[PDB]
A paper describes a structure:
In natural photosynthesis, the light-driven splitting of water into electrons, protons and molecular oxygen forms the first step of the solar-to-chemical energy conversion process. The reaction takes place in photosystem II, where the Mn4CaO5 cluster first stores four oxidizing equivalents, the S0 to S4 intermediate states in the Kok cycle, sequentially generated by photochemical charge separations in the reaction center and then catalyzes the O–O bond formation chemistry. Here, we report room temperature snapshots by serial femtosecond X-ray crystallography to provide structural insights into the final reaction step of Kok’s photosynthetic water oxidation cycle, the S3→[S4]→S0 transition where O2 is formed and Kok’s water oxidation clock is reset. Our data reveal a complex sequence of events, which occur over micro- to milliseconds, comprising changes at the Mn4CaO5 cluster, its ligands and water pathways as well as controlled proton release through the hydrogen-bonding network of the Cl1 channel.
Specifically, a slight elongation of the O5 density toward W2 and a slight elongation of the W4 density toward W3 are observed at 250 μs. The Ox omit density becomes asymmetric starting at 250 μs, with a clear reduction in intensity after 500 μs and dropping to the noise level between 1,200 and 2,000 μs, and Ox can only be modeled with a population of less than 20% in the 2,000 μs time point. At 250 μs, the D1-E65 residue rotates by 19° toward W40, resulting in shortening the distance between D1-E65 and W40 by 0.3 Å. This is the time point when the Ox density starts to become asymmetric, which is even more pronounced at 500 μs. We observed the start of the rotation of D1-E65, which is proposed to be part of the proton gate, and the formation of the hydrogen bond pathway from the OEC to this region at 250 μs. The Yzox formation triggers the first deprotonation event likely during the time period of 200–500 μs15–17,24,34,39.
Author numbering:
A (entry chain e): 3 to 84
B (entry chain a): 11 to 344
C (entry chain d): 12 to 352
D (entry chain f): 12 to 45
E (entry chain v): 1 to 137
F (entry chain c): 23 to 473
The structure:
């Protein structure tokens, strides 16, 4: 039977549906695009940019080797990039 | 009627306990020859120079194997794809040394298995059934052709066919990964979806029919006696099963057509295993899994390893150690 | 009515997506496990834990993205966001591997919630809870592989990472270090999964090709009414087909569908048991009698010894980069290699 | 006379709107140069 | 790390003069190196003679020295054995043998220099990986 | 609603082309429009290949599968397989693409506007699947068309500029064929060769004379068979043996196509005569043999005595004997000793590879071809990274022999499945139980119990 909600086939074909979503969908797409193009996703998650994996002359990986000094360890690695 | 017609009626008789049929006329002698040779070779056959380098691998129980390590060993690389019947050898001893039983077994077997498929069609016709059970069997049969026939063809040697053994299968799988990166090949990823999904949907459908069995027994007896062989009624409430499973997910993720539901059970693992058979068959021609080795580099050009580069380090370990004495030149082109 | 009874009413309302009491556990944890995996494969690195890029943002594709395991120096830490390692710092949390425990632990409880949902919905509709029972095998697998196995090892580092190629690395690790193909519990696992897929295909095919003609069309799907009483295919003709083709056949439909439950479920349970052993490195790695003979007899060779040579290749060639915290330095000359290659 | 805001509404939007956001993010990534 | 001009600075000649390439010439030399040389030289080794790689130390001990742009350009015109004693244009691609090695025909003097720079710049980035073979993959 | 719906035609939308089984005009339209797509693709692809073609690179480095088919026929190519004039490629492409428009026009005309069934408009073009006379007649016509097409290849080789002959003295060239092989002991000998190693059934054909000769026989056989079927109707043993229905005829062809797909697969992988390695890249065996040759040469140059170099296993490091004694390259390539190629045969004497010729007669062009082929072995990844699975990114290469073999195995396999599907259905349909078992007369229920 029917649990009482409006049928999806009815909603997506409705004009009012697309009036609302001709904006929200492209707006959300643009918001995500901006999230990366501003470089903001690097800083929120601590992901290296292509230039910040190694120091200029090092080939060693900044692997964290301590449980409780780990947050301190990562920050020390980040300042040897400058 | 005359003798030929009496024979034909017997051959095609639907009253034989096991159906014979025209396919069975080929299937029985070939499956018997293959089976008898397999059993004797697995127990007693002496060591086989699989890689053609005069370094025989012992495959049989009497020569120090157990059930897990034993195998009928593929025929010698010196033979490549040449036909090596018993009568081409100078002696059975020579035939044993070079891995003759492997050719005899797999050819008789592939022939008989093909006829098994055809026999499935044949009895379905005498019985008045729809004919496509044999299509379902074509997925495992194609898989068998892939590893025993197609892959030795494209690599040019039966010595690179799959061994008839438990440990030899794993040897085949590991060498295959190193040379084709089969894990990174989507037809194998399709085959995993095919069998994982098959097992899932097996458990689902079994659990869902079992869940909606109609009470026809008391608690001191097996519910299986609630079903009588040949009964016209169904023994479970498919509406109840839909009602349960539709609420478990949502109403339209659930089947209510038994025929649709059952065809889906047939189609999912068959298609997936078709693809994995096609995966072995096309990697026989060295169209391998995706290669993302050093795909990620940084601003300077340093390689930034991904999980694919780790997989490559395991592949390289399998590459350099497999058939350790067999290669004289830096590339392993087949 | 009490407030409890009224909340019970609304949780159990018949709606497009049933909620229930179990939903309070299921939907938050399943969504957050899902979301954390998406978030991490899109944006999060494994640079400081593994020396690996692991996200779309770093230029990985769908097969090579992963939420990777924490660094080995974390041991078995819960890696709480507010715990001593990250100290509430979300960015450092991602960098230290916290999304892995985030996904693993929320997913554990999500799986608990889903099973309770199966119990809850079965209880309300009125059917026996065999579906919930069958779902014990996925849970046994998840718990043994993602939780028990690393808890027996040195750290979460060696649990599986959540990614397509990461799981492939896991497979190959188990071959080279554990000789897992040789394990009888995995072999039973393989028999149950391959056997399940077989039963799925053969039963589906058998039903489709013993249908009764209940309509006039060539598409036979419309000739089935879900309220009909009669069986839609011939159990008698199927039984005779298979008796004459294969020698035996099912004759009891109830045993047939219980067997379909039993086979894949029992298979996964058996593999779970084997991985618990591997938590302790309690492997079926060797056959002693073969090793005693091989060591004394340089002409004795089987597929067993050949595969151990392959295992030694995997370990030595993959360890330095796969366990970077160990600082393995293997000069070229110690690497095991056959001729030429 | 159907409602517009249902539990179902929350369900599709808990999934759909993050999905679209993530797609635009992944789209932009294809133009990152090293 | 990034591709800086210090990285992009390589010996012009044996006499010690250097030259600084642009990012464009580096990428150009890599594309062309793939086009005309990688089939045998992928990653700095030599598939058809693994005893000779493209490591700078190796190029240095060649006769004449090959660890500089002019030395490499000269090799791609008139290649010789490691000791300079024989000319190998008949079995090694070069401008001298662009009739038998057709991929060399369209190449120009700027192209050979870009390829030479790529070869000389690449072990500065990759280290042991360049010319080390599968051990360092 | 002329069929076009499930209720009237009996077939659901996903099996909709089965609504066409007894609409010969609408069916004719489908076949001609589909032929339009085949000719279209042949046209567009060649022009695509021509747009992307760089004549200084080998064809097999450029992802070409159609231009190699034109070059093999003698057009646009000179000694050594060097490309001299790209204009015939352009002609072949343009002419196919133009034709697809007229094919496509006639297909869309017949499928949409034309008469749905041909039988009332014309007794010659209309047909009934069960008319065993009309069916062998149409078969006969298409046989003649096929024999003619086979003779077109003969016309090209003997009268219209010849064919590319990889075996031609001096490194390969276009060559008029003047003495095709007519001796039927040779032509039909090929059909009786074993398909196993060192024999190769028809895949072993290694000279253009046998190729042109066999196409004379086939062209004449097809023309004569077409006449035979135009004039005759099937005999009684044939009438009792076959199912005479549209679907049955479909299934016979599906099986036939499947068989041919598997043979083509093996042809493109092993044969280097009608798939010249100059255009298609080396075969798998060829590249592996070329590796052993490369390192024989390098080491012999350094002073090694290659004939007496005992390898690690006790077998010769460079040279050893096949099981029938021929001298062959050693190492794993021992499996490939059946390989034959223009660059290697000069080193062959009566006992196999000749050690004197190896020590003295190896020319720089052989060292070049052997190095080129070893480095273009048909190994490579799905994203076209060339080499073994463990190679790093750099070389963007997959051999067209790999592309052509793998694609046609897949197609050949799925057409075998299609054969089984339609053959079993055609049988069940002809007997009247393709829609299921009749409840009121279930055949099994009228049989004795097995036990
Ligand atoms: C089926 C139902 C499924 C439902 C599951 C739903 C999910 C439930 C949530 C589960 C989360 C459990 C996390 C347990 C973490 C853990 O264990 O964390 C591990 C810690 C122990 O910490 C470890 O301790 C180790 C031993 O160190 C000790 O010894 C060292 C010796 O050198 C030093 O002396 C050191 O100071 C001292 O601490 C190392 O230090 C490790 O690095 C460190 O991680 O134990 C502790 O938290 C607690 C230990 C008490 C045991 C609690 C039981 C949990 C384990 C059950 C499985 C055990 C069997 C595994 C197979 C074997
Ligand atoms: C109804 C029909 C029923 C059939 C009943 C009889 C079945 C027998 C068929 C035997 C096929 C199996 C073994 C053949 C495998 C083989 O080595 O096949 C390869 C041979 C080619 O042989 C090679 O041919 C070569 C020819 O090249 C030679 O000549 C060339 C000339 O240019 C080059 O110079 C080259 O260097 C030189 O070596 C050499 O002779 C090689 O040594 C030799 O191996 O192909 C061929 O004969 C073409 C045929 C291959 C067909 C592939 C079989 C179909 C695949 C199984 C179907 C899957 C089933 C689906 C499951 C459901
Ligand atoms: C597209 C090609 C084609 C097709 C589909 C047919 C189809 C048919 N032909 Mg025609 N035919 C053709 C081409 C074709 N023919 C050509 C080119 C010739 C000239 C040689 C003939 C000459 C010919 C004659 C003389 C006769 C037919 C007959 C028939 C009918 C019986 C078919 C039969 O029994 O199959 C074959 C199935 C069998 C069981 C027969 C045994 C064949 C064995 C099993 C195969 C092995 C032998 C093989 C021929 C050679 C070995 C090759 C091997 C190495 C691979 C059928 C309608 C018969 C008929 O009714 O005529 C009106 C008949 O008498 N055909
Ligand atoms: C279904 C609900 C649910 C469940 C089971 C979990 C479970 C978990 N989450 Mg998740 N979480 C949820 C929803 C949920 N979460 C939601 C909705 C969000 C988004 C805001 C998050 C965001 C989130 C983050 C960001 C993190 C977790 C983390 C955790 C873990 C640690 C939890 C902890 O220490 O709690 C401690 C708190 C309690 C156990 C609650 C105690 C309640 C009271 C005080 C007890 C005393 C009662 C009193 C004495 C008697 C009352 C009687 C009554 C009659 C009144 C655990 C796996 C962490 C994790 O995964 O680490 C890796 C982590 O970092 N969660
Ligand atoms: C090779 C592909 C191919 C071809 C040639 C056909 C051909 C045909 N189909 Mg099949 N079909 C196909 C694929 C194909 N189909 C697939 C993939 C499906 C599954 C979705 C179906 C499902 C299907 C069903 C369910 C039915 C058919 C039917 C038909 C027939 C009539 C169609 C009709 O009335 O359309 C009318 C449509 C239109 C008038 C719209 C425009 C159609 C034209 C042809 C488009 C041409 C575009 C092109 C650019 C023109 C270039 C012009 C240029 C040359 C000048 C026709 C002979 C019908 C049938 O059997 O009739 C009884 C029918 O019921 N087909
Ligand atoms: C016999 C069929 C066949 C074969 C062997 C090839 C082979 C080739 N083509 Mg071609 N092609 C074909 C049909 C074929 N094509 C068709 C029908 C089209 C029209 C769409 C094209 C359009 C085409 C273009 C536009 C281009 C090629 C290119 C290429 C090359 C690289 C292909 C690649 O990267 O695959 C990538 C692999 C895949 C996409 C995997 C496909 C997986 C499929 C969808 C699953 C199969 C399912 C089904 C049951 C079969 C290679 C030489 C390229 C080239 O180098 O040109 C010079 C190129 O740019 N082809
Ligand atoms: C094999 C394909 C094929 C077949 C069997 C038919 C059959 C038919 N068509 Mg169709 N048609 C086709 C292709 C085909 N057509 C194509 C490609 C087009 C577009 C150009 C048309 C356009 C078309 C129209 C517009 C009409 C028909 C009509 C007809 C009917 C009578 C035609 C007639 O007798 O002409 C007489 C035959 C001749 C004069 C013989 C000469 C034909 C050419 C010049 C011979 C070329 C052969 C060539 C050498 C072979 C190689 C070709 C290629 C492989 C290179 C008949 C049912 C008519 C009909 O029934 O509608 C009411 C109609 O009005 N057809
Ligand atoms: C800081 C937290 C803020 C809240 C965040 C949400 C997370 C908390 C868990 C609750 C998730 C689901 C809430 C459902 C909201 C809803 O649609 O009903 C709330 C009401 C009633 O809708 C009603 O929806 C009903 C359909 S059903 O119950 O959802 O099936 C229907 O019965 C009724 O007639 C109709 O009017 O509608 C609105 O939302 C007004 C806008
Ligand atoms: C029926 C049908 C169908 C089908 C259809 C079809 C199949 C069709 C086809 C069609 C076709 C098949 C068409 C064709 C077309 C073509 C054309 C249109 C061409 C053109 C050409 C040109 C124009 C060219 C040009 C040029 C030149 C000349 C030179 C160079 C450059 C160029 C290229 C530009 C469908 C399924 C859909 C649907 C249903 C029905
Ligand atoms: C061109 C060429 C050539 C030639 C070729 C030829 C000459 C061919 C021929 C061909 C042929 C000559 C073929 C044949 C075929 C056959 C077949 C394929 C058969 C089939 C059959 C069938 C199928 C049958 C079946 C059946 C039975 C058995 C029983 C009953 C039922 C039935 C009928 C079904 C050569 C190589 C030199 C070279 C290159 C080129
Ligand atoms: C000394 C360190 C201080 C760190 C303070 C900042 C940390 C705040 C984290 C808040 C996370 C809230 C989600 C946790 C609730 C989920 C557990 C549950 O609901 O059962
Ligand atoms: O892996 Mn590696 O590649 Ca196919 O051959 Mn060359 O070596 Mn050997 O014989 Mn068995 O196997
Ligand atoms: Cl091995
Ligand atoms: Cl070798
Ligand atoms: Fe069932």
């Amino acid at each position: 039977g029917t649990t009482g909600e409006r049928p999806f086939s009815d909603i997506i074909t409705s004009v009012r549906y697309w009036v609302i979503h001709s904006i929200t969908i492209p707006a959300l797409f643009i918001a995500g695009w901006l999230f990366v193009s501003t470089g903001l996703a690097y800083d929120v998650f601590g992901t290296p940019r292509p230039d910040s994996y190694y120091a200029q002359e090092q080939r060693s990986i900044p692997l964290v080797t301590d449980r409780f000094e780990a947050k301190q360890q990562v920050e020390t690695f980040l300042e040897q990039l400058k | 009627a005359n003798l030929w017609e009496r024979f034909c009626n017997w051959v095609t008789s639907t009253d034989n306990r096991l159906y014979v049929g025209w396919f069975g006329v080929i299937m029985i002698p070939t499956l018997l020859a293959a089976t008898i040779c397999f059993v004797i070779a697995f127990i007693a056959a002496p060591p086989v120079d699989i890689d053609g380098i005069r370094e025989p691998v012992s495959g049989s129980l009497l020569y120090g194997n157990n059930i897990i390590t034993g195998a009928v060993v593929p025929s010698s690389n010196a033979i490549g794809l040449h036909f090596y019947p018993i009568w081409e050898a100078a002696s059975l001893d020579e035939w044993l040394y070079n891995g003759g039983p492997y050719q005899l077994i797999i050819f008789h077997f592939l022939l008989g298995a093909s006829c098994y498929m055809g026999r499935q069609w044949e009895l379905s016709y005498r019985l008045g059934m729809r004919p496509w059970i044999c299509v379902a069997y074509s997925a495992p049969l194609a898989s068998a052709f892939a590893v025993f026939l197609i892959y030795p063809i494209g690599q040019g040697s039966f010595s690179d066919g799959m061994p008839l053994g438990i440990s030899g299968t794993f040897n085949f799988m590991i060498v295959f990964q190193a040379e084709h990166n089969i894990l990174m090949h989507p037809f194998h990823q399709l085959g995993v979806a095919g069998v994982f999904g098959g097992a899932l949907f097996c458990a689902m459908h079994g659990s869902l029919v079992t869940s909606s069995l109609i009470r026809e027994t008391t608690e001191t007896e097996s519910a299986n006696y609630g079903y009588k062989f040949g009964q016209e009624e169904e023994t479970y409430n498919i509406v109840a099963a839909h009602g349960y499973f539709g609420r478990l997910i949502f109403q339209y993720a659930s089947f209510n057509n038994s025929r649709s539901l059952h065809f889906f059970l047939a189609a999912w693992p068959v298609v997936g295993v078709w693809f994995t058979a096609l995966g072995i068959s096309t990697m026989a021609f060295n169209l391998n899994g995706f290669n993302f080795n050093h795909s990620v580099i940084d601003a300077k050009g340093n390689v930034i390893n991904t999980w694919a580069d780790i997989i490559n380090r395991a592949n390289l370990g399998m590459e350099v150690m497999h058939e350790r004495n067999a290669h004289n030149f830096p590339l392993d082109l087949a | 009515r009490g407030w409890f009874d009224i909340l019970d009413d609304w949780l159990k309302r018949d709606r497009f997506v049933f909620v229930g009491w179990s939903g309070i556990l299921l939907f938050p944890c399943a969504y957050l496990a899902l979301g954390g995996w998406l978030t991490g494969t899109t944006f999060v690195t494994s640079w400081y834990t593994h020396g690996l890029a692991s996200s779309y943002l770093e230029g990985c594709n769908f097969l090579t993205v992963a939420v990777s395991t924490p660094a080995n120096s974390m041991g078995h830490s819960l890696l709480l966001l507010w715990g001593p390692e990250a100290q509430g710092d979300f960015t450092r949390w991602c960098q230290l591997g916290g999304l892995w425990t985030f996904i693993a632990l929320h997913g554990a409880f999500g799986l608990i919630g889903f099973m309770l949902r199966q119990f809850e919905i079965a209880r309300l509709v009125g059917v026996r809870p065999y579906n919930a029972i069958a779902f014990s095998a996925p849970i046994a697998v998840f718990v043994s592989v993602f939780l028990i196995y690393p808890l027996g090892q040195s750290s979460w580092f060696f649990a599986p990472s959540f990614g397509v190629a990461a799981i492939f690395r896991f497979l190959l690790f188990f071959q080279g270090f554990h000789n897992w193909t040789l394990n009888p519990f995995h072999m039973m696992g393989v028999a149950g999964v391959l056997g399940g897929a077989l039963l799925c295909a053969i039963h589906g095919a058998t039903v489709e090709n013993t249908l009764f003609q209940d309509g006039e069309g060539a598409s036979t799907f419309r000739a089935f009414n879900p309220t009909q009483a009669e069986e839609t295919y011939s159990m008698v003709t199927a039984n005779r087909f298979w008796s004459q083709i294969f020698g035996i056949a099912f004759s009891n439909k109830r045993w047939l569908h219980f067997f379909m439950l039993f086979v894949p479920v029992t298979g996964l349970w058996m593999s779970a048991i084997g991985v618990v052993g591997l938590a302790l490195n309690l492997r079926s790695y060797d056959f002693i009698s073969q090793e005693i003979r091989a060591a004394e007899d340089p002409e004795f060779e089987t597929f067993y010894t050949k595969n151990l040579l392959l295992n030694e290749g995997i370990r030595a060639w993959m360890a330095p980069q796969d366990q970077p915290h160990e600082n393995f330095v293997f000069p070229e000359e110690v690497l095991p290699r056959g001729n030429a290659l | 006379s159907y409602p517009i805001f249902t539990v179902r509404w929350v369900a599709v939007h808990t999934l759909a709107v993050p999905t679209i956001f993530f797609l635009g993010a992944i789209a932009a990534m294809q133009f990152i140069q090293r | 790390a990034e591709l800086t001009p210090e990285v992009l600075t390589v010996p012009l000649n044996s006499e010690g003069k250097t030259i600084t390439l642009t990012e464009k010439q580096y990428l150009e030399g890599k594309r062309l190196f793939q086009y005309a040389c990688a089939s045998c030289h992928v990653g700095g080794i030599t598939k058809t003679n693994p005893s000779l790689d493209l490591r700078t130390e190796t190029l240095a001990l060649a006769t004449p020295p090959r660890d500089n742009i002019e030395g490499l350009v000269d090799y791609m015109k008139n290649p010789t054995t490691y000791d300079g004693e024989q000319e190998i244009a008949e079995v090694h691609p070069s401008l001298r043998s662009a009739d038998i090695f057709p991929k060399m025909r369209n190449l120009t003097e700027k192209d050979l220099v870009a390829i030479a720079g790529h070869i000389l710049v690449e072990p500065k980035i990759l280290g042991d990986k360049w010319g080390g073979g599968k051990v360092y993959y | 609603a002329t069929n076009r719906d499930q209720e009237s035609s009996g077939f659901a939308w996903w099996a909709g082309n089965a609504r066409l089984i007894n609409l010969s005009g609408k069916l004719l339209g489908a076949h001609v429009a589909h032929a339009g797509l085949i000719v279209f693709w042949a046209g567009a692809m060649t022009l695509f290949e021509l747009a992307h073609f760089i004549p200084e690179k080998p064809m097999y480095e450029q992802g070409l599968i159609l231009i190699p088919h034109i070059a093999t026929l003698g057009w646009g190519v000179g000694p050594g397989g060097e490309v001299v004039d790209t204009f015939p490629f352009f002609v072949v492409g343009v002419v196919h693409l133009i034709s697809s428009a007229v094919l496509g026009f006639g297909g869309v005309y017949h499928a949409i506007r034309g008469p749905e069934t041909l039988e009332e408009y014309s007794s010659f073009f209309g047909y009934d699947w069960k008319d065993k006379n009309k069916m062998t007649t149409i078969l006969g016509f298409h046989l003649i068309v096929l024999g003619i097409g086979a003779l077109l290849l003969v016309a090209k080789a003997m009268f219209f500029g010849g064919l590319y002959d990889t075996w031609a003295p001096g490194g390969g060239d276009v060559r008029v064929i003047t003495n095709p092989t007519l001796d039927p002991r040779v032509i039909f000998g090929y059909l009786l060769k074993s398909p196993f190693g060192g024999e190769g059934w028809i895949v072993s054909v290694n000279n253009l004379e046998d190729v042109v000769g066999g196409h004379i026989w086939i062209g004449l056989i097809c023309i004569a068979g077409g006449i035979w079927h135009i004039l005759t109707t099937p005999f009684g043993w044939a009438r009792r043996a076959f199912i005479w229905s549209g679907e049955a005829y479909l299934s016979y062809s599906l099986g036939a196509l499947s068989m041919m797909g598997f043979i083509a697969t093996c042809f493109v992988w092993f044969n280097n005569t009608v798939y010249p390695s100059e255009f298609y890249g080396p075969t798998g065996p060829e590249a592996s043999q070329a590796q052993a040759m490369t390192f024989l040469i390098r080491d012999q140059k350094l002073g090694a005595n290659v004939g007496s170099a005992q390898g690690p296993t006790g077998l010769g490091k460079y040279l050893m004997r096949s099981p029938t004694g021929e001298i062959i390259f050693g190492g794993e390539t021992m499996r490939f000793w059946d390989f034959r190629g223009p660059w290697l045969e000069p080193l062959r004497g009566p006992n196999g590879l000749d050690l004197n010729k190896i020590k003295n007669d190896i020319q720089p062009w052989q060292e070049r071809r052997a190095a080129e082929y070893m480095t273009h072995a048909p190994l490579g990844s799905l994203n076209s990274v060339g080499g073994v699975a463990t190679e790093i990114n750099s070389v963007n290469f997959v051999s067209p022999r790999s592309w052509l073999a793998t694609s046609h195995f897949v197609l050949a396999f799925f057409f075998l499945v299609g054969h089984l599907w339609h053959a079993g259905r055609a049988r069940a349909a002809a007997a009247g139980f393709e829609k299921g078992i009749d409840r009121e007369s279930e055949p099994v229920l009228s049989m004795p119990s097995l036990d």
